[PDB]
């Protein structure tokens, strides 16, 4: 198990489901990868037909909450590697689309709507699909969802323009918080759209899974941070790690019922006002980039915040430790096998453990962390209004 | 005067500069508008030449901190009204470009780089321009900045392809926080790229000015809210009001040196986890959208948060009061002359007052609000590294 905890301890503390769902991630990813591998020809044919038909293609990666951050996290990688004049990638939350459809859904633009959902039962998921069908003349869909009996999945069959990519059944997280659903969806999406050769994807997958298991094995390293005196947490990252930070900090908010206040930023963005949030009771964690160029900017920022000596702790997740003063460096090293976009997986596993253990520290029940009932596993109170 | 305060009172409190710069906004905006009026034919001709040469044009709206939020706020409006296959609008912070230039700056894409800066002395401003010039074959620039002797402005002369649009000198805010600088730059940008007829823009400008004066006249109303017990502030807004919420919350952070923790979200996004931050010492303010359809989603959310009865106060800025239970409704009514994108101006004045008065409440010196010196008016410690 995790730390010393027995399964019995975890049940008594209301953390068995969430702990199980975090720890099952490498196994879930291997199933997802194998499903990808079996479907890869069909998936590539699907996308190729669209490319053959249309000169400009708007791809919209869309979900709500943690499902929105799937697109946010992967977006900068796709933007780098694709020519925007052909495949124009966007991450637009379902919660944005439902409120302002006209901003995003345009009649004459060929559009591939890539819908993400753990439960499939957020009203905004179906409303976004329905608005897209209403407003876009040439619409295709890729539906990436974990619940085969969720409304999103149920309405995604028998349509030659909708590629349904169900995630493994156990990734339909019963926990309040999305854990294995988030990472499984993100892995599927990266495998689908990453133009890298299959053999390279395979190798990277194996290293992703190895690194993640190492993180899980060393939960005590995360506990060391949890044990510090803090009630604010700030996650920072550049590139894909900006959306990853957004997810990492949300996991805290959610699992501590906001008893820990939070922020996400990039390291370079952080200086321009947001850094004001730091106080003596703040932990700052950086998801480090490993390209030589971008790493330099991370390092200057970590040096500065450590040097300020205000924060309780500055933590840098990277591929190596330089031996920085007043920084906890967490070295997760691939031998360089992984590029940055695949490092999101072990990095978020660390973040999930931090959120889980912090929930336990504050005596919240991670599996059911909103005792007021004002936040819910499946969103409540969403009304869809008719658009004309 | 603001409230009871004399100029000597404000001097004593370290608030004279910021108070002045907020209150000068209507006058600054008229000067900005008159400049635009004078230059509009030249401006249109500049953009028309670009459209005459290139089939696909990438517009990048770029700044750091509050300057980034000019682009974030206006972007959804430009996205709605432009055809993305011709004019493809993006808001990408200078703090993102400098760290990951290859994500955004593409050799073969005709690009219009629209740079924002109050001081012009952020290293990322010049690095962003330099990276664009070194990477993009067909580049044009629009430089919108408040400091004629800032480094950005000073390198923007004598270039046919760089359209320099200096803002009124007094908008080079001496206060730590950007107030009139943000608004002047945002007004100029909207006037440049809004395809509405000039006669309509002039009509709206007059109502903007009038409503903003009314907000300033009624500072006592904001004070009443600031007097409530709270240490967390959440701003919510849809469409342009998401970026505006980002700015509104940053103002609090900056001016209270993080003594008040903050969040920005959209009303519909808020439910999917972020709502967890609410506690009994939290004030939630919503920048209300006035289109019939989107407004319905604001209203559902406000009803819900009010009905939960946890937050200290729920405040809705709009064009009218419906008479909502447990909500403070602030009605700023144009008679319907203003569309939502022009309502950002009166809305942000209200949020500036809220931040300034909260700063006074916590006995910070709003003009110089970082007594640790770890956050600065002009960013310190940014090193620019060579990109290959
Ligand atoms: Cl009140």
XYZ file of C-alpha atoms and ligand atoms in Angstrom:
777
model
C 0.000 0.000 0.000
C 0.718 3.736 0.401
C 3.000 4.743 3.196
C 2.238 2.539 6.174
C -1.486 2.561 5.565
C -3.381 -0.598 5.543
C -6.425 -0.971 3.374
C -8.440 -0.912 6.646
C -6.924 2.475 7.579
C -7.797 3.875 4.161
C -11.412 2.691 4.409
C -11.791 4.249 7.873
C -10.355 7.558 6.565
C -12.557 7.694 3.470
C -9.612 7.403 1.070
C -9.724 3.832 -0.276
C -11.264 4.666 -3.647
C -9.099 7.634 -4.454
C -5.906 5.851 -3.354
C -6.807 2.843 -5.478
C -7.590 4.993 -8.492
C -4.257 6.891 -8.266
C -2.264 3.665 -7.867
C -4.004 1.842 -10.763
C -2.808 4.432 -13.243
C 0.092 2.552 -14.827
C -2.113 -0.518 -15.340
C -4.936 1.636 -16.825
C -2.432 3.331 -19.151
C -1.172 0.023 -20.494
C -4.791 -1.006 -21.306
C -5.362 2.388 -22.966
C -2.170 2.007 -24.968
C -3.161 -1.453 -26.128
C -6.588 -0.179 -27.171
C -4.841 2.622 -29.093
C -2.518 0.147 -30.755
C -5.467 -2.020 -31.865
C -7.324 1.019 -33.265
C -4.401 2.954 -34.660
C -5.123 2.180 -38.330
C -8.772 3.157 -38.058
C -7.890 6.291 -36.134
C -5.310 7.329 -38.705
C -7.788 6.603 -41.593
C -10.455 8.710 -39.819
C -8.176 11.719 -39.542
C -6.704 11.221 -43.029
C -10.162 11.355 -44.642
C -10.813 14.671 -42.930
C -7.436 16.007 -44.122
C -8.217 14.829 -47.660
C -11.592 16.577 -47.635
C -10.800 19.948 -46.028
C -8.125 22.613 -46.405
C -8.482 24.180 -42.973
C -9.609 22.053 -40.048
C -10.428 23.477 -36.578
C -9.761 20.922 -33.865
C -11.515 21.780 -30.569
C -10.406 19.868 -27.452
C -13.340 20.294 -25.086
C -14.267 19.248 -21.525
C -15.311 20.701 -18.186
C -13.042 21.139 -15.121
C -10.294 18.549 -14.987
C -11.540 17.330 -18.388
C -10.828 20.814 -19.832
C -7.249 20.597 -18.656
C -6.616 17.561 -20.850
C -6.743 19.952 -23.845
C -5.085 22.827 -21.997
C -2.124 20.633 -21.083
C -1.601 19.053 -24.514
C -2.424 22.101 -26.598
C 1.046 23.773 -26.727
C 2.599 20.517 -27.947
C 0.096 20.163 -30.771
C 0.491 23.905 -31.652
C 4.235 23.423 -31.944
C 4.155 20.333 -34.137
C 1.237 21.146 -36.425
C 0.864 23.772 -39.151
C -2.004 25.951 -37.940
C -2.999 26.744 -41.538
C -4.142 23.102 -41.888
C -4.803 21.631 -38.448
C -5.719 24.514 -36.169
C -5.709 23.206 -32.574
C -7.731 24.884 -29.778
C -8.626 23.925 -26.208
C -12.035 25.408 -25.425
C -13.919 24.191 -22.343
C -17.458 22.860 -22.707
C -18.282 25.432 -20.032
C -17.137 28.192 -22.458
C -18.872 26.712 -25.486
C -22.254 26.392 -23.793
C -22.250 30.023 -22.693
C -20.854 31.586 -25.847
C -21.323 29.178 -28.697
C -21.082 31.810 -31.421
C -17.584 32.717 -30.389
C -16.247 29.224 -31.218
C -18.690 27.348 -33.443
C -18.647 28.790 -36.915
C -20.848 27.624 -39.778
C -18.312 27.444 -42.624
C -15.238 26.157 -40.720
C -14.638 22.342 -40.880
C -14.434 21.336 -37.238
C -13.301 18.264 -35.345
C -14.893 18.373 -31.861
C -12.908 16.220 -29.421
C -15.095 15.674 -26.308
C -13.686 14.561 -22.994
C -15.655 13.304 -19.986
C -15.119 10.957 -17.027
C -18.791 10.389 -16.191
C -20.269 11.549 -19.490
C -23.083 13.169 -17.457
C -22.174 16.853 -17.321
C -25.030 18.615 -19.163
C -22.463 20.853 -20.836
C -20.987 17.847 -22.676
C -24.174 17.045 -24.579
C -25.099 20.733 -24.959
C -21.692 21.373 -26.583
C -22.231 18.468 -29.012
C -25.739 19.631 -29.790
C -24.651 23.274 -30.345
C -21.855 22.050 -32.661
C -24.261 19.970 -34.719
C -26.624 22.915 -34.902
C -24.093 25.571 -35.940
C -21.264 23.850 -37.886
C -21.967 22.723 -41.444
C -19.124 20.141 -41.576
C -18.602 18.581 -38.185
C -16.631 15.508 -37.094
C -16.221 14.176 -33.610
C -13.765 12.231 -31.512
C -15.391 11.134 -28.228
C -12.897 10.209 -25.452
C -14.759 9.111 -22.375
C -14.461 6.660 -19.515
C -18.146 5.857 -18.865
C -19.664 3.521 -21.459
C -23.100 4.212 -19.856
C -22.599 7.947 -19.515
C -24.805 10.084 -21.681
C -21.887 11.299 -23.845
C -20.825 7.731 -24.800
C -24.407 6.522 -25.249
C -25.114 9.086 -27.985
C -21.805 8.468 -29.825
C -22.566 5.212 -31.697
C -23.398 4.424 -35.320
C -22.095 7.710 -36.725
C -19.371 7.521 -39.313
C -18.270 11.024 -38.353
C -17.909 10.224 -34.598
C -14.854 8.179 -33.530
C -15.666 6.787 -30.082
C -12.545 5.982 -28.032
C -13.749 4.496 -24.733
C -11.178 4.447 -21.935
C -10.692 1.422 -19.725
C -13.750 0.745 -17.608
C -11.967 1.105 -14.234
C -10.822 4.623 -15.205
C -14.409 5.774 -14.699
C -13.201 7.012 -11.314
C -15.656 6.510 -8.444
C -13.623 9.041 -6.456
C -14.935 12.608 -6.346
C -11.662 13.687 -8.003
C -10.632 12.611 -11.443
C -7.338 10.776 -11.323
C -6.939 7.782 -13.667
C -9.707 9.234 -15.896
C -7.674 12.404 -16.439
C -4.412 10.638 -17.270
C -6.035 7.919 -19.391
C -7.881 10.496 -21.498
C -4.751 12.591 -21.844
C -2.663 9.538 -22.860
C -5.219 8.489 -25.499
C -5.339 12.010 -26.902
C -1.555 12.314 -27.081
C -1.247 8.938 -28.800
C -3.959 9.928 -31.304
C -2.573 13.273 -32.350
C 1.203 13.036 -31.623
C 2.819 12.681 -35.082
C 5.753 10.687 -33.707
C 6.383 7.159 -35.011
C 4.613 4.327 -33.221
C 7.843 2.655 -32.143
C 8.887 5.873 -30.350
C 5.462 6.132 -28.667
C 5.831 2.591 -27.441
C 9.234 3.247 -25.908
C 8.053 6.414 -24.287
C 4.988 4.675 -22.904
C 7.180 2.116 -21.150
C 9.303 4.865 -19.573
C 6.199 6.874 -18.563
C 4.881 3.815 -16.768
C 8.244 3.089 -15.118
C 8.601 6.661 -13.825
C 5.006 6.747 -12.534
C 5.490 3.502 -10.595
C 8.660 4.972 -9.073
C 6.712 8.032 -7.902
C 4.021 5.818 -6.363
C 6.708 3.666 -4.694
C 8.265 6.743 -3.054
C 5.106 8.324 -1.572
C 7.155 9.083 1.516
C 9.007 11.768 -0.380
C 5.654 13.542 -0.917
C 4.688 13.024 2.723
C 7.790 14.958 3.736
C 6.279 18.008 2.009
C 2.775 17.396 3.358
C 4.170 17.452 6.863
C 5.302 21.097 6.472
C 3.269 24.033 7.866
C 1.329 25.445 4.935
C -2.111 26.491 3.827
C -1.391 27.820 0.290
C -0.022 25.891 -2.629
C 1.150 27.314 -5.924
C 1.923 25.124 -8.948
C 4.026 26.635 -11.749
C 4.826 25.328 -15.214
C 5.697 26.437 -18.718
C 4.289 24.998 -21.930
C 2.216 21.880 -21.249
C 2.964 22.246 -17.577
C 0.794 25.355 -17.343
C -2.416 23.347 -17.832
C -0.851 20.595 -15.729
C -0.386 23.121 -12.925
C -4.009 24.146 -13.302
C -5.013 20.502 -12.729
C -2.486 19.965 -9.880
C -3.793 22.917 -7.894
C -7.413 21.996 -8.500
C -6.772 18.557 -6.993
C -5.780 20.372 -3.759
C -8.772 22.704 -3.755
C -11.087 19.865 -4.331
C -9.703 17.368 -1.860
C -9.180 19.878 0.957
C -12.577 21.604 0.402
C -10.607 24.833 -0.176
C -8.890 24.709 3.216
C -5.714 25.139 1.187
C -5.891 28.136 -1.160
C -4.165 27.754 -4.502
C -2.795 29.192 -7.695
C -1.415 28.107 -11.102
C 0.990 30.123 -13.195
C 4.060 29.814 -15.403
C 7.434 30.537 -13.842
C 8.060 33.578 -16.117
C 4.426 34.759 -15.726
C 4.625 34.388 -11.984
C 6.821 37.460 -11.409
C 4.316 39.918 -12.921
C 2.036 40.240 -9.910
C 0.932 36.669 -9.064
C 4.039 36.162 -6.853
C 2.243 38.450 -4.386
C 0.356 35.377 -3.112
C 3.490 33.900 -1.509
C 3.644 33.984 2.234
C 5.376 32.032 5.044
C 2.721 29.316 4.793
C 2.992 28.753 1.051
C 4.568 25.808 -0.771
C 5.581 26.517 -4.433
C 6.006 23.530 -6.731
C 7.468 23.782 -10.221
C 6.909 21.305 -12.993
C 10.319 21.644 -14.680
C 10.875 21.698 -18.444
C 13.872 19.686 -19.665
C 14.755 21.436 -22.947
C 18.059 23.313 -22.443
C 16.482 26.698 -23.399
C 13.273 26.685 -21.407
C 14.936 25.036 -18.376
C 17.056 28.195 -17.954
C 13.944 30.304 -17.311
C 12.627 27.775 -14.759
C 15.947 27.840 -12.973
C 16.181 31.635 -12.712
C 12.689 31.732 -11.198
C 13.340 28.902 -8.683
C 16.573 30.683 -7.657
C 14.686 33.923 -7.087
C 11.824 32.475 -5.030
C 14.256 30.340 -2.938
C 16.452 33.354 -2.515
C 13.539 35.471 -1.255
C 13.273 33.070 1.694
C 9.538 33.752 2.248
C 7.857 30.523 1.071
C 7.741 27.538 3.335
C 9.181 25.379 0.569
C 10.156 25.627 -3.101
C 10.050 22.287 -4.955
C 11.299 21.613 -8.463
C 10.319 18.441 -10.331
C 12.802 17.819 -13.155
C 15.088 15.178 -14.751
C 17.992 15.976 -12.390
C 18.969 17.809 -9.243
C 21.542 20.588 -9.539
C 21.963 20.940 -5.750
C 20.084 24.240 -5.478
C 20.080 26.040 -2.077
C 16.652 26.150 -0.411
C 14.970 24.084 -3.143
C 13.699 20.513 -2.932
C 14.612 18.977 -6.251
C 12.743 15.857 -7.313
C 14.695 14.071 -10.059
C 12.573 11.878 -12.372
C 14.929 10.863 -15.111
C 14.283 9.056 -18.388
C 17.888 8.973 -19.645
C 16.377 11.543 -22.013
C 13.892 9.007 -23.498
C 10.957 11.289 -22.754
C 10.281 14.625 -24.272
C 8.471 17.086 -22.068
C 4.953 16.295 -23.236
C 5.228 12.685 -21.945
C 6.623 13.885 -18.592
C 3.171 15.209 -17.640
C 2.281 11.668 -16.507
C 4.773 11.062 -13.648
C 4.565 14.778 -12.714
C 0.784 14.692 -12.160
C 1.052 11.454 -10.227
C 3.272 13.310 -7.717
C 0.671 16.134 -7.558
C -2.182 13.713 -7.011
C -0.383 12.050 -4.103
C 0.285 15.534 -2.621
C -3.417 16.451 -2.825
C -4.504 13.053 -1.423
C -2.140 13.174 1.540
C -2.927 16.835 2.241
C -6.627 15.865 2.314
C -5.793 13.274 4.873
C -3.760 15.800 6.898
C -6.779 18.157 7.221
C -9.049 15.206 8.112
C -11.158 15.472 5.014
C -12.374 12.258 3.432
C -10.723 12.373 0.025
C -13.313 10.111 -1.625
C -16.199 12.387 -0.517
C -14.427 15.725 0.115
C -17.372 18.186 0.004
C -19.323 17.654 3.202
C -21.334 20.811 2.449
C -22.498 19.136 -0.775
C -21.909 22.358 -2.701
C -19.405 20.681 -5.038
C -20.125 17.250 -6.508
C -18.510 14.349 -8.397
C -21.015 14.863 -11.203
C -21.953 18.512 -11.519
C -25.363 19.537 -10.104
C -27.648 22.447 -11.011
C -26.543 22.978 -14.569
C -29.460 24.138 -16.739
C -29.108 24.137 -20.538
C -30.954 26.969 -22.186
C -32.090 26.931 -25.828
C -29.893 28.794 -28.223
C -31.369 30.425 -31.316
C -12.330 63.354 -3.843
C -12.731 59.684 -3.066
C -14.873 59.261 0.037
C -13.802 61.608 2.896
C -10.123 61.587 1.894
C -8.108 64.743 1.271
C -5.082 64.678 -1.034
C -2.995 64.970 2.129
C -4.912 62.027 3.636
C -4.062 59.945 0.582
C -0.443 61.018 0.635
C -0.217 59.962 4.253
C -1.755 56.595 3.361
C 0.545 55.926 0.388
C -2.479 55.999 -2.009
C -2.375 59.383 -3.765
C -0.877 58.124 -6.961
C -3.080 55.070 -7.540
C -6.249 56.972 -6.556
C -5.363 59.696 -9.039
C -4.574 57.213 -11.841
C -7.911 55.394 -11.395
C -9.876 58.631 -11.309
C -8.124 60.074 -14.424
C -9.387 57.231 -16.552
C -12.341 58.930 -18.259
C -10.105 61.877 -19.240
C -7.282 59.589 -20.424
C -9.739 57.548 -22.471
C -11.078 60.637 -24.277
C -7.522 61.566 -25.208
C -6.921 57.999 -26.393
C -10.148 58.092 -28.374
C -9.286 61.416 -30.030
C -5.882 60.060 -31.052
C -7.530 57.008 -32.553
C -9.999 59.285 -34.310
C -7.094 61.254 -35.815
C -5.162 58.154 -36.890
C -8.028 55.871 -37.884
C -7.521 56.190 -41.673
C -3.852 55.418 -41.364
C -4.600 52.529 -39.018
C -7.196 51.049 -41.387
C -4.830 51.419 -44.335
C -2.050 49.638 -42.419
C -4.290 46.639 -41.725
C -5.803 46.646 -45.219
C -2.365 46.322 -46.860
C -1.725 43.253 -44.717
C -5.065 41.765 -45.753
C -4.287 42.591 -49.377
C -1.029 40.580 -49.258
C -1.789 37.521 -47.136
C -4.553 34.900 -47.211
C -4.012 33.823 -43.594
C -2.883 36.292 -40.938
C -1.996 35.329 -37.337
C -2.643 38.114 -34.870
C -0.838 37.755 -31.619
C -1.929 39.958 -28.748
C 1.029 39.878 -26.317
C 1.960 41.371 -22.946
C 2.989 40.326 -19.403
C 0.833 40.389 -16.229
C -1.944 42.916 -16.518
C -0.740 43.691 -20.057
C -1.411 40.055 -20.990
C -5.005 40.490 -19.872
C -5.690 43.202 -22.496
C -5.517 40.449 -25.099
C -7.186 37.798 -22.915
C -10.169 40.106 -22.333
C -10.699 41.286 -25.924
C -9.915 37.947 -27.632
C -13.340 36.245 -27.431
C -14.946 39.309 -29.056
C -12.428 39.353 -31.914
C -12.873 35.588 -32.300
C -16.612 35.931 -32.652
C -16.524 38.743 -35.197
C -13.629 37.650 -37.422
C -13.250 34.725 -39.815
C -10.413 32.686 -38.345
C -9.361 31.512 -41.812
C -8.380 35.090 -42.649
C -7.627 36.876 -39.389
C -6.666 34.324 -36.761
C -6.647 36.064 -33.354
C -4.591 34.833 -30.410
C -3.653 36.185 -26.961
C -0.240 34.774 -26.062
C 1.654 36.325 -23.186
C 5.177 37.648 -23.705
C 6.029 35.361 -20.722
C 4.874 32.368 -22.780
C 6.576 33.390 -26.032
C 9.950 33.993 -24.390
C 9.963 30.540 -22.780
C 8.625 28.557 -25.756
C 9.050 30.637 -28.923
C 8.764 27.732 -31.348
C 5.223 26.934 -30.128
C 3.889 30.267 -31.395
C 6.320 31.858 -33.776
C 6.251 30.100 -37.133
C 8.464 30.933 -40.109
C 5.857 30.600 -42.814
C 2.834 32.230 -41.140
C 2.208 35.932 -41.855
C 2.001 37.417 -38.364
C 0.885 40.674 -36.797
C 2.488 41.010 -33.378
C 0.511 43.419 -31.204
C 2.728 44.291 -28.205
C 1.361 45.817 -24.966
C 3.346 47.485 -22.221
C 2.822 50.171 -19.536
C 6.545 50.869 -18.893
C 7.993 49.207 -21.959
C 10.844 47.925 -19.740
C 9.917 44.290 -19.220
C 12.753 42.277 -20.771
C 10.179 39.804 -22.141
C 8.674 42.597 -24.279
C 11.847 43.150 -26.272
C 12.734 39.438 -26.278
C 9.328 38.627 -27.773
C 9.846 41.196 -30.533
C 13.373 39.951 -31.196
C 12.276 36.320 -31.359
C 9.481 37.233 -33.753
C 11.853 39.122 -36.047
C 14.332 36.207 -36.039
C 11.739 33.461 -36.646
C 8.886 34.873 -38.782
C 9.399 35.588 -42.497
C 6.488 38.065 -42.867
C 6.047 40.041 -39.683
C 4.151 43.243 -38.917
C 3.820 44.920 -35.537
C 1.385 47.168 -33.703
C 3.048 48.641 -30.631
C 0.541 49.877 -28.002
C 2.446 51.235 -25.026
C 2.192 53.989 -22.447
C 5.861 54.998 -22.043
C 7.372 56.970 -24.940
C 10.826 56.478 -23.378
C 10.299 52.808 -22.547
C 12.592 50.429 -24.409
C 9.671 48.920 -26.394
C 8.522 52.340 -27.760
C 12.105 53.464 -28.465
C 12.847 50.508 -30.748
C 9.576 50.967 -32.667
C 10.397 53.979 -34.838
C 11.229 54.284 -38.520
C 9.717 50.907 -39.485
C 6.996 50.842 -42.167
C 5.783 47.573 -40.736
C 5.545 48.764 -37.117
C 2.540 50.933 -36.263
C 3.376 52.743 -33.025
C 0.325 53.778 -30.965
C 1.502 55.608 -27.909
C -1.060 56.139 -25.170
C -1.449 59.463 -23.286
C 1.673 60.199 -21.225
C -0.189 60.290 -17.887
C -1.311 56.682 -18.521
C 2.254 55.588 -17.897
C 1.058 54.788 -14.393
C 3.523 55.651 -11.588
C 1.461 53.527 -9.248
C 2.707 49.978 -8.735
C -0.510 48.627 -10.241
C -1.560 49.320 -13.806
C -4.917 51.097 -13.878
C -5.235 53.747 -16.587
C -2.525 52.031 -18.574
C -4.570 48.839 -18.777
C -7.733 50.610 -19.776
C -6.191 53.023 -22.267
C -4.344 50.164 -24.041
C -7.471 47.991 -24.033
C -9.610 50.896 -25.425
C -7.063 51.593 -28.170
C -6.897 47.902 -29.184
C -10.672 47.580 -29.295
C -10.991 50.726 -31.358
C -8.344 49.458 -33.805
C -9.764 46.000 -34.359
C -13.497 46.362 -33.711
C -15.104 46.295 -37.177
C -18.114 48.361 -36.030
C -18.645 51.719 -37.773
C -16.903 54.738 -36.306
C -20.160 56.536 -35.577
C -21.262 53.625 -33.361
C -17.858 53.489 -31.646
C -18.150 57.201 -30.789
C -21.630 56.708 -29.364
C -20.384 53.842 -27.192
C -17.324 55.769 -26.070
C -19.615 58.469 -24.648
C -21.655 55.936 -22.624
C -18.443 54.181 -21.462
C -17.133 57.509 -20.196
C -20.431 58.386 -18.523
C -20.871 54.999 -16.757
C -17.245 55.004 -15.598
C -17.740 58.485 -14.079
C -20.835 57.190 -12.317
C -18.877 54.303 -10.843
C -16.241 56.696 -9.591
C -18.884 59.056 -8.170
C -20.286 56.185 -6.197
C -17.081 54.879 -4.495
C -18.980 54.810 -1.223
C -20.952 51.864 -2.559
C -17.778 49.836 -3.091
C -16.555 50.869 0.385
C -19.688 49.322 1.929
C -18.740 45.969 0.396
C -15.071 46.297 1.336
C -16.163 46.761 4.998
C -17.489 43.175 5.155
C -15.382 40.477 6.837
C -13.440 38.602 4.144
C -10.023 37.355 3.166
C -10.821 35.606 -0.141
C -12.178 37.251 -3.318
C -13.440 35.371 -6.362
C -14.196 37.135 -9.668
C -16.282 35.327 -12.289
C -17.094 36.254 -15.838
C -17.958 34.669 -19.199
C -16.526 35.635 -22.616
C -14.473 38.805 -22.280
C -15.243 38.920 -18.604
C -13.038 35.868 -17.912
C -9.910 37.874 -18.790
C -11.393 40.822 -16.962
C -11.902 38.684 -13.882
C -8.237 37.619 -14.145
C -7.219 41.305 -14.001
C -9.717 42.205 -11.260
C -8.412 39.495 -8.951
C -4.757 40.344 -9.714
C -5.403 43.885 -8.603
C -6.466 42.612 -5.148
C -3.486 40.293 -4.895
C -1.009 43.005 -5.861
C -2.472 45.729 -3.640
C -2.952 43.582 -0.519
C 0.415 41.819 -1.008
C -1.563 38.574 -1.096
C -3.218 39.088 2.284
C -6.450 38.354 0.406
C -6.285 35.137 -1.604
C -8.085 35.146 -4.928
C -9.482 33.252 -7.931
C -10.860 34.018 -11.420
C -13.268 31.709 -13.243
C -16.306 31.683 -15.502
C -19.747 31.206 -13.870
C -20.311 27.879 -15.677
C -16.697 26.741 -15.105
C -16.829 27.596 -11.406
C -19.013 24.654 -10.499
C -16.595 21.977 -11.720
C -14.280 22.127 -8.683
C -13.134 25.737 -8.260
C -16.248 26.472 -6.210
C -14.429 24.579 -3.456
C -12.575 27.776 -2.474
C -15.728 29.429 -1.148
C -15.892 29.808 2.601
C -17.652 32.184 4.978
C -14.904 34.749 4.561
C -15.202 34.794 0.790
C -16.775 37.569 -1.433
C -17.801 36.424 -4.949
C -18.248 39.072 -7.663
C -19.657 38.315 -11.081
C -19.151 40.475 -14.132
C -22.527 39.937 -15.699
C -23.090 39.383 -19.404
C -26.075 41.206 -20.968
C -26.890 39.102 -24.041
C -30.193 37.305 -23.420
C -28.715 33.790 -23.834
C -25.423 34.018 -21.901
C -27.090 36.030 -19.155
C -29.249 33.034 -18.293
C -26.136 31.059 -17.281
C -24.824 33.868 -15.083
C -28.195 33.991 -13.304
C -28.336 30.258 -12.591
C -24.885 30.353 -11.049
C -25.548 33.411 -8.938
C -28.822 31.897 -7.658
C -26.936 28.767 -6.686
C -24.033 30.408 -4.903
C -26.477 32.768 -3.099
C -28.724 29.900 -2.157
C -25.843 27.876 -0.686
C -25.516 30.637 1.926
C -21.831 30.060 2.608
C -20.091 33.085 0.961
C -19.952 36.398 2.839
C -21.482 38.151 -0.145
C -22.423 37.466 -3.780
C -22.256 40.563 -6.012
C -23.508 40.761 -9.633
C -22.536 43.695 -11.864
C -25.032 43.958 -14.726
C -27.236 46.347 -16.647
C -30.166 45.956 -14.270
C -31.232 44.423 -10.948
C -33.738 41.529 -11.126
C -34.227 41.633 -7.352
C -32.289 38.425 -6.585
C -32.420 37.065 -3.005
C -29.041 37.218 -1.220
C -27.261 38.977 -4.068
C -25.994 42.560 -4.239
C -26.894 43.693 -7.757
C -24.996 46.649 -9.156
C -26.898 48.061 -12.154
C -24.809 49.928 -14.717
C -27.252 50.582 -17.498
C -26.545 51.929 -20.977
C -30.124 51.770 -22.258
C -28.598 48.972 -24.345
C -26.171 51.257 -26.215
C -23.192 49.189 -25.071
C -22.554 45.691 -26.188
C -20.727 43.599 -23.670
C -17.216 44.184 -24.928
C -17.454 47.903 -24.171
C -18.835 47.222 -20.672
C -15.413 45.964 -19.532
C -14.500 49.594 -18.894
C -17.034 50.536 -16.186
C -16.771 47.017 -14.721
C -13.005 47.222 -14.199
C -13.215 50.663 -12.617
C -15.485 49.097 -9.960
C -12.898 46.298 -9.414
C -10.042 48.816 -9.236
C -11.872 50.700 -6.505
C -12.537 47.459 -4.660
C -8.801 46.581 -4.717
C -7.669 50.049 -3.781
C -10.087 50.334 -0.886
C -9.227 46.780 0.310
C -5.568 47.768 0.234
C -6.369 50.701 2.492
C -8.421 48.440 4.746
C -5.383 46.129 5.325
C -3.172 49.195 5.869
C -0.974 48.548 2.857
C 0.303 51.487 0.886
C -1.418 50.916 -2.428
C 1.160 53.004 -4.316
C 4.045 50.881 -2.988
C 2.301 47.660 -1.899
C 5.214 45.174 -1.758
C 7.151 46.077 1.360
C 9.250 42.896 0.926
C 10.356 44.203 -2.461
C 9.752 40.753 -3.967
C 7.228 42.094 -6.491
C 7.926 45.254 -8.483
C 6.279 47.934 -10.662
C 8.794 47.043 -13.355
C 9.784 43.404 -13.171
C 13.211 42.624 -11.718
C 15.520 39.640 -12.225
C 14.361 38.541 -15.687
C 17.226 37.168 -17.678
C 16.824 36.679 -21.403
C 18.653 33.661 -22.770
C 19.852 33.114 -26.302
C 17.525 31.032 -28.423
C 19.045 28.876 -31.204
Cl -23.249 44.746 1.472
